[PDB]
């Protein structure tokens, strides 16, 4: 299983929107980054909770 570019962008956008209005970060933060960077590090650490629904 692999993540497409559109799916990854949607996941990062949803995670950043969640972080902006709540949703505390599941990993450490560099104390000053934007929520988009927080979502990027969450994706890089493989800790994101958001899945992708695919038709079948």
């Amino acid at each position: 299983f692999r993540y497409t570019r559109f799916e990854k962008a949607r996941i990062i956008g949803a995670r950043a929107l969640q972080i902006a209005m709540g949703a505390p970060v599941l990993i450490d933060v560099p104390e000053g980054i934007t929520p988009l960077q927080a979502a990027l590090l969450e994706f890089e650490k493989g800790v994101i909770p958001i899945t992708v629904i695919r038709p079948s």
Binding site: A9, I12, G13, A16, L17, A20, L36, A39, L40
Partner: peptide, 12 residues
């Protein structure tokens, strides 16, 4: 402006 738009620009 929105976080989703920024993420879309950064990724795509």
């Amino acid at each position: 402006q929105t976080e989703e738009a920024q993420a879309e620009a950064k990724i795509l």
